[PDB]
């Protein structure tokens, strides 16, 4: 019970017998779609650290345990001996397929521990490796390509105004890490004023999107060029020609200023291409500057009664005193209707998340931070994300297809800083 080392996913998982969400659960993540072959008992070639030699050589290792990008390896020949089991990023540079060492002409050197556990190594490896699963062809090329992102620095995009949700303003991509963009407002009012978001964030749009859709924008008064519109994530097309959302319709929505809560909300504006301006009752400026933009297909908006039927705490209007809050009484007092349930119809993906699974999650209240996290609840496609060590008051509601969730090891793979559990 005396831990005298820093944080590592490996020891964290082994010690408490944790389970990590596989890379498969993250479509946006690198190798998220080319991961079907990676599994336990898959053999690879990795450097042999069990060598007194001053140089470096390789050996065969099998995957004992797979946690996100991180794989627990055991050198071939140890069998059940876990004495030299070591963790690694399976997408790491030193991990190769099995043909790679000899077809390139380097000798496989057995670990010093089992050098005399078997006499004939040619016969040994032939019996062990014949018909064994390994890494897919051009796998290292796959990994390399996954680390190459179409969003380049100096690209201009439109993004929501952090301090004025109702309008967008032009930001510039200054740096890209693991598909995550550090955006800087073109007309900053703060020295390090940034906007961390993913490439395929629904919050960023091409130049001219605000004007085209009817969304408010900040009018402005260096090598920067406009992002090719074909790079942005595609929005699901809808048919708003018939029955559709109307101004005044009541609903439930995740507060963009507090992603820990789902709030009583109202449709304030119906825009083009499916987009809607939504306000939270009790927290609306008279000029409508607090109106946020959710698409009609957004997983962050819910029909009236969603929270109650699924046993989720609903945040009543600020200042509202008739507790506990009842939608029926509120619809009478405010003389309004609920947005029809049929408008919220959406597919519920087989995401593969399970309660208790570990992952790397963006702090949505501070997008700079990416922290060790856990899935504590699952409401169809709605996930309750908990940050290990911290108070559950700050658990955030996150969609299962969110690009702000990442597999275990994503930080190490992409070179992004990972926050460890609170002390």
């Amino acid at each position: 019970a005396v831990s005298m080392e820093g944080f590592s996913w490996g020891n964290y998982i082994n010690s408490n017998s944790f389970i990590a969400a596989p890379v498969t659960c993250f479509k946006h993540a690198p190798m998220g779609t080319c991961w079907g072959d990676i599994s336990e008992n898959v053999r690879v070639e990795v450097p042999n650290t069990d060598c007194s030699l001053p140089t470096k050589v390789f050996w065969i290792a099998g995957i004992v345990k797979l946690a996100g990008y991180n794989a627990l390896l055991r050198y071939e020949g140890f069998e059940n001996d876990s004495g030299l089991d070591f963790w690694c990023n399976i997408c790491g540079s030193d991990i190769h397929p099995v043909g790679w060492c000899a077809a390139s002409g380097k000798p496989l050197v057995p670990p010093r521990t089992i050098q005399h556990k078997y006499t004939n190594w040619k016969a040994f490896l032939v019996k062990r490796l014949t018909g064994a699963k390994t890494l897919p062809p051009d796998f290292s090329q796959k990994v390399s390509e996954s680390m190459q992102y179409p969003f380049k620095p100096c690209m201009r995009v439109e993004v929501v105004d952090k301090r004025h949700l109702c309008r967008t303003r032009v930001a510039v991509v200054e740096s890209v890490i693991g598909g995550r963009l550090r955006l800087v407002y073109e007309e900053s009012e703060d020295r390090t004023d940034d906007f961390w978001c993913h490439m395929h964030s629904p919050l960023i749009h091409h130049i001219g999107w605000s004007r085209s859709i009817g969304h408010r924008f900040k009018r402005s008064d260096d090598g920067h060029f406009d992002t090719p519109p074909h790079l942005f994530a595609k929005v699901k097309e809808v048919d708003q020609s018939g029955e559709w959302f109307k101004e005044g319709m009541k609903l439930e929505a995740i507060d963009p200023l507090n992603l820990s809560t789902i709030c009583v909300a109202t449709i304030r504006k119906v825009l083009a291409d499916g987009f809607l301006m939504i306000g939270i009752d009790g927290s609306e400026a008279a000029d409508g500057s607090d109106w946020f933009c959710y698409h009609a297909t957004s997983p962050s908006i819910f029909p009236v009664g969603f929270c109650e039927i699924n046993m989720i705490e609903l945040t009543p209007p600020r200042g509202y005193t008739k507790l506990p809050f009842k939608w029926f009484d509120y619809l009478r007092e405010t003389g309004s209707i609920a947005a029809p349930v049929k408008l919220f119809n959406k597919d519920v993906p087989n995401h593969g998340f399970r309660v208790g699974m570990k992952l790397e999650a963006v702090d949505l209240m501070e997008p700079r931070l990416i922290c060790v996290a856990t899935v504590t609840r699952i409401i169809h496609r709605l996930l309750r994300i908990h940050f290990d060590g911290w108070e559950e008051e700050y658990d955030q509601w996150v969609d299962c297809e969110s690009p702000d969730l990442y597999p275990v090891g994503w930080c190490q793979l992409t070179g992004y800083q990972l926050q460890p559990p609170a002390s």
């Binding site: 072959d37 397929p97 060492c101 000899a102 190594w121 490796l129 014949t130 018909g131 390994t134």
Partner: peptide
């Protein structure tokens, strides 16, 4: 897919 994987320490045949 299966291929003939090279081993130096001859060849072995494995699935990728």
């Amino acid at each position: 897919e299966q291929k003939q994987v090279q081993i130096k320490t001859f060849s072995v045949t494995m699935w990728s």
